[PDB]
Design a protein around this ligand. Structure first.
Ligand SMILES: C/C(NCc1cnc(C)nc1N)=C(/S)[C@H](O)COP(=O)(O)OP(=O)(O)O
Ligand SMILES: C/C(NCc1cnc(C)nc1N)=C(/S)[C@H](O)COP(=O)(O)OP(=O)(O)O
Ligand SMILES: C/C(NCc1cnc(C)nc1N)=C(/S)[C@H](O)COP(=O)(O)OP(=O)(O)O
Ligand SMILES: [Mg+2]
Ligand SMILES: [Mg+2]
Ligand SMILES: [Mg+2]
Lengths: 565, 565, 565
């Protein structure tokens, strides 16, 4: 019959996982054995649990959901940072922790890996703060219901969930899992509300000429990217993407006008948004960074707020209205309103100004790195863009339809990109997978490139070596922004370990000129058997113009004085 | 006048810190500026926050207390694993997190680095589970009391504490700190209880010939190492150390009989403890690992339980009795009882059997590594011993008076030893600092060796390359015990980065024979300007005899069946 | 436009409330003002907050949902006991607490009614433990989403929820509420799972002659009472009700065999359940009391477990299958299987033995009270039966189709019945409402009878004056089971207060014989303007036979010795 462990394994396969990620520990080893019995998915190992969590986060970006398996307390507490990250970025990551033998509860027993006390609910209680569901399993009869509950919750809420499983019950028998269709069972839109939300939107824009659409970073979580284009093509108004929504709308679409991000918007976009009579915001996240230090907030009286599962429009709130349905029906009924796009064109603001190819023997500069990476973009490419100036470099790139950008702009844990790129490339090996990561960020999680070597993943890594934390320098500078430099190129042979117990096919190259970068890229593209790290040398102050302006607003928001209470 | 930040700085200097550890982030930059104004301590930077926390843990082992400064949520959640570690290992580590501008509470504001919701008490609430005190500071007037409370609590309980400081109040004025003596103010022993606990101990052993003393791993937390020797010298009974208490009792002392650890005890110790009429346990921790899978538990009827701040003896419980006072006073009143040591000697069990020097050209084996490391021990040496077979290799070493061993046996987070060794070597640069760390553990936290390079710390690192997780292999084996191999020796030149933006004086060497190891040790001893990593190659199954036996009991305890409820 | 307060008011009207319950306090007065603006519901006041919560609980039993409004901390903490009760009994009760001015967060301000510290998230965090959803509202813009989320959650989960509203935002403007239909929007059954669950049930009983149906106490929460009858009529097998499910199945139905409650079952039922080949359990709650101290637990091999939203049958678990749908579809597909009923009839066990009418001048006994109350039952009657021997007296009564019994057997808070009867009679004034409550229970919450007087509710109260806690006497006796006696009959004129500031039409009567009881019942039935309390005098040991037997098993389960861990 099924066991607690194989029940969990079958449910993971049923929701579409082809892989799950893990770090062994004595509290989870039997559970890992059970998961390995299901040959419809592979078990992938990680260096540490923070990286294991972020690897699952990256895999969920590629495949829609993911799972990570860690040991009690010492494994789960660090993995919590990555699970909070999954919560912040709306990804269904299932964290499963091994846990104490079920005889040790209420027994006055002190156990290894715990705090030295005799009670073991602290980890579960901590996990409730950063998950949508969190269940401890102490007996085998309780497992099927707790597993089904947390997996249904993760999928319908697009949030991470927690499970712990007593180490001595992982191989115990339980009931068999029913059909997979039950796991995707979710509310439909309330018919009357859906129709009323659509109707009130038509009423709201009936006498408004300039209707602009602002694409937000929960659009994919709502499963509404295709429906958005149906609507925007019907409307014919100007469409802009918020920074974190890059690649959630087609940039070669005739109505696309570029990035909306306050004073670091593409030319003409800020003025177009300001002059709109109505802004239809599709699942946006308005926080201190996306509003450019609270300087760029949508006019409340011009706003139609279409979240994933509700619409606020014309002064009325509509719960139980799914964004995909709302956009699809609105697309069928809306009239053609081109005024916002006419207005944008009338500014004659031109396209984003980009640098021409550098003299190849001149010293490398940031703009030349960005040009050559941008030239690699195809319909089959994904760029993983780390927190740092890589945010702003990636934002400036024109995406061919189908090309994807992965951003972690809400959580913003530097170092996320390395393990996230590993997990993503495991989930989508058919793609050209590019990682843009700063030197400062790289040092927090660099060891996961060794797993890329191990699984022969041809990830192209652009390591931006500007000697320190340049985005922090452009917010508020001090001696804490300085780091110890590494030979980053040389680290690839360290992870290969050729002549040691195993081998690898990673390559590490240095680029100090445009010519050296172009040559390194050719070698990277030809290396199909392992990752290629290109160490790019540029000055600390050689950064985007956008970062300089945005960093000043962030610094001011963070330090603004207390108000009188 | 003082500010919130300089108040904190002065309090940390007053409890004896010469250094604090940090990883910058926009929510803590101003706070770091304020801490830097106090020139009586240095601010040391770390690669990531899990390592920052463990670096503080290691420094508290050297100096008594420590502090780590991180950014909100993305920095604190991973640092929580290390703080839970400090709780488990009884070290006063002060975690200070930057936090949101104080205007963002109750304002409907979504902020970067948080969950996407508008409330910010989740981190504090999570921190309460793993600390002795935990205070959020939202206004400057509240800072002095919360800082004084958590620092007093940490010192008196020997436990980690938590602070968060709103980022816009770090430079705001507050009252000045009073005398340092107030921070160390603690209860004295209750005089009637102290005398009664001593008297009932005399009554309990009055007709008990064989009295053995069992030294436990909370002895240093009780500040009772020197008082323990006063008592054991007066009693003259056999003295044994639990595994995690190695170096908390002088091994050249005439009454010392070696390690007590169930069936992996030193020769004759297990039998001596079993035959004792009374066991006086000094601040023990009895858990599933220290009891060898619950197979070695002290006889309740023969036990005198002298914890740090209470004694249970002769059927009576005495709270408010401090262990240093109890031992000092009992030393003055106890009679000479040599029966247990006479019994031990009567066994003729001999000393722990150790291997003779290997043929220097033969393939390196585990026992030869342990012999050469043991030969480097002086009165000025400290050995940092990682979770893994290094636990058992270090346990076997004879310590000259003054030599120290640092263990993390309660928390047991593999990878602790790298950052802990960095922090310890910052705190105690005058000592011969040796790190024994397995390959699997090293990969969790390896980047903190670059900080050793940066501060020119001459840490001697023995990297045990047995290609995988051998201790886990000896508990329960599977494909999850296999790892990707690295060129560990070559990583030292990567962290030097000579020819790059800066430089280093680290050296990495390989040892595949006893002769190569001896040579590498000479070079390590002569390298005063950076760390020396010696990559030692041995087989997976070439491990201590003790690990094989202990691992089987641990596996059986972990998997024992549920009992009928 | 709508305000935070009138938004909440309209949502409560939309889910069907005609009344909400409240206790004034300065943190909620403006909120109460706003709620009063909606004239589609009445605001009902209570004596204290524990009674206010239980009044809402009773009202949800009558109408399906309810709301209670209290002041911060001093009002909410006692109301939490009643909210936990609503969670335990599966009732959608919405607790709304007033809360501090939104300027007092992060301001170093100490406030009245709170703990003396300067932070105010403790109440919210406590509420999360006993609710399905819990949201604090600090700004008006955040109110609509949090209100809609908690109300939808309460209805779909059939569980209580929590809201707190800053006292200075209750009259602030917010968006208007959409259609009421959105609040009832819930998942449908997964169609493949529903058909498969039905088919696997047919497969399971295919070669099983005696199929018995066991009706559980979550049948009403699943909305499946009528579907159960469709299925049982089609099957034609014996049908029994668990104790807490009394009145959730029609007792005049030809297949009904009476109460299943282990050794205190109706005659022939225990043997019939034991001999069944299959037991189909409809939404059961198996706990220490319903299993008669764990002596009566269903055979796992014979069990079909049809919960509210899942079925476990034939070794397979089916999430996403709603009980009403499962029973309706199974009713259409099942064959006639009368074997369990034939078996029951073949026992010739006879009907439950009931006492003949007493000599009317003899001293009143418990069986004569129960006979005269049972004779008052009509199709329009509800009996509210308090924890105590009234549980067992009520269980013995034959219900005419349509008559209801209300039990609080999972929470079991003595004193629940008085405020619950008040709230139920406000929600269902057309019914003949009978309260059976013991003297001990009455003393916890007696003051809510004054509200019955105030609103002129003709509740007939049988006060069972056996001088103390008889059910506790029959579990384990001591001096703690003794209470101070009151003139309970005389309390009705106290709550009238005729000749004081107002008036009342309550009547209190004493009954010491069957004749006196019959006369008091006549007066009670004729009193249409207020409650009538009949103080019935019986001996401490004059209790049901069932209580004696059940109490012994409960005492033994509670005291069973710890098992070896
Ligand atoms: C230290 C920090 N942010 C604070 C931070 C610190 N800790 C964690 C885990 N997450 C964080 N965001 C940041 S953005 C650096 O400047 C990034 O440095 P790098 O990767 O080197 O990029 P650039 O040089 O382009 O800025
Ligand atoms: C994986 C794990 N323990 C589980 C574990 C996993 N995750 C964390 C953070 N802490 C833990 N203790 C352990 S003990 C390894 O076998 C250690 O490997 P290594 O350092 O390579 O040592 P040996 O080869 O001598 O055993
Ligand atoms: C004290 C207690 N139960 C414990 C209890 C105590 N506190 C609360 C709030 N809830 C509880 N169930 C119980 S059942 C009494 O015997 C009830 O007394 P009474 O109402 O007088 O009934 P009977 O005499 O028929 O038993
Ligand atoms: Mg950098
Ligand atoms: Mg190893
Ligand atoms: Mg009574």
């Amino acid at each position: 019959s099924y066991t607690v462990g194989t029940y969990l394994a079958e449910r993971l396969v049923q929701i579409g996982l082809k892989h799950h990620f893990a770090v062994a520990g004595d509290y989870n080893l039997v559970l890992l054995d059970n998961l390995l019995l299901n040959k419809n998915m592979e078990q992938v190992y990680c260096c540490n649990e923070l990286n294991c969590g972020f690897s699952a986060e990256g895999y969920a970006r590629a495949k829609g959901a993911a799972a990570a398996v860690v040991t009690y307390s010492v494994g789960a507490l660090s993995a919590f940072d990555a699970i909070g990250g999954a919560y912040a970025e709306n990804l269904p990551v299932i964290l499963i922790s091994g846990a104490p033998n079920n005889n040790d509860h209420a027994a006055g027993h002190v156990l290894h890996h715990a705090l030295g006390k005799t009670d073991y609910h602290y980890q579960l209680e901590m996990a409730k703060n950063i998950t949508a569901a969190a269940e401890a399993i102490y007996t085998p009869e309780e497992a099927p219901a707790k597993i089904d509950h947390v997996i249904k919750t993760a999928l319908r809420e697009k949030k991470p969930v927690y499970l712990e499983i007593a180490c001595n019950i992982a191989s115990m028998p339980c009931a068999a899992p029913g059909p997979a269709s039950a796991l995707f069972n979710d509310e439909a839109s309330d018919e009357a509300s859906l129709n009323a939300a659509v109707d009130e939107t038509l009423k709201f824009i009936a006498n408004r000429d300039k209707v602009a659409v602002l694409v937000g970073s929960k659009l994919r979580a709502a499963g509404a990217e295709e429906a958005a284009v149906k609507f925007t093509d019907a409307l014919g108004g100007a469409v802009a993407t918020m920074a974190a929504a890059k690649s959630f709308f087609p940039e070669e679409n005739a109505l696309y006008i570029g990035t909306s991000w306050g004073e670091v918007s593409y030319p003409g976009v800020e003025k177009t948004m300001k002059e709109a009579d109505a802004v239809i915001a599709l699942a946006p996240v308005f926080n201190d960074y996306s509003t450019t230090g609270w300087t760029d907030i949508p006019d409340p009286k011009k706003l139609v707020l279409a979240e994933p599962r509700s619409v606020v429009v014309n002064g009325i709130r509509f719960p139980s209205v799914h964004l995909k349905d709302y956009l699809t029906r609105l697309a069928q009924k809306v009239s053609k309103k081109t005024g916002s796009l006419d207005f944008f064109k009338s500014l004659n603001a031109g396209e984003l100004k980009k640098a021409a190819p550098a003299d190849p023997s001149a010293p490398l500069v940031n703009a030349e790195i960005a040009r050559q990476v941008e030239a690699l973009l195809t319909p089959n490419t994904t760029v993983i863009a780390e927190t740092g100036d890589s945010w702003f470099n990636a934002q400036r790139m024109k995406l061919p339809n189908g090309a994807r950008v992965e951003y972690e702009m809400q959580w913003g844990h530097i170092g996320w990109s390395v393990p996230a790129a590993f997990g993503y490339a495991v989930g989508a090996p058919e793609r050209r997978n590019i990682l843009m990561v700063g030197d400062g960020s790289f040092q927090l999680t660099a060891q996961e490139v060794a797993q890329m070597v191990r699984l022969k993943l041809p990830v192209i890594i652009f390591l931006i070596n500007n000697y320190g934390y340049t985005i922090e320098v452009m917010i508020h500078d001090g001696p804490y922004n300085n780091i110890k430099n590494w030979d980053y190129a040389g680290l690839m042979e360290v992870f290969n370990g050729n002549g040691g117990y195993d081998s690898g096919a990673a390559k590490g190259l240095k680029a100090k000129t445009g010519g050296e970068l172009a040559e390194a890229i050719k070698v990277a593209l030809a290396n199909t058997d392992g990752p290629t790290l290109i160490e790019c040398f540029i000055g600390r102050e050689d950064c985007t113009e956008e970062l300089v302006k945005w960093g000043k607003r962030v610094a001011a928001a963070n330090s603004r004085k207390p108000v009188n209470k």
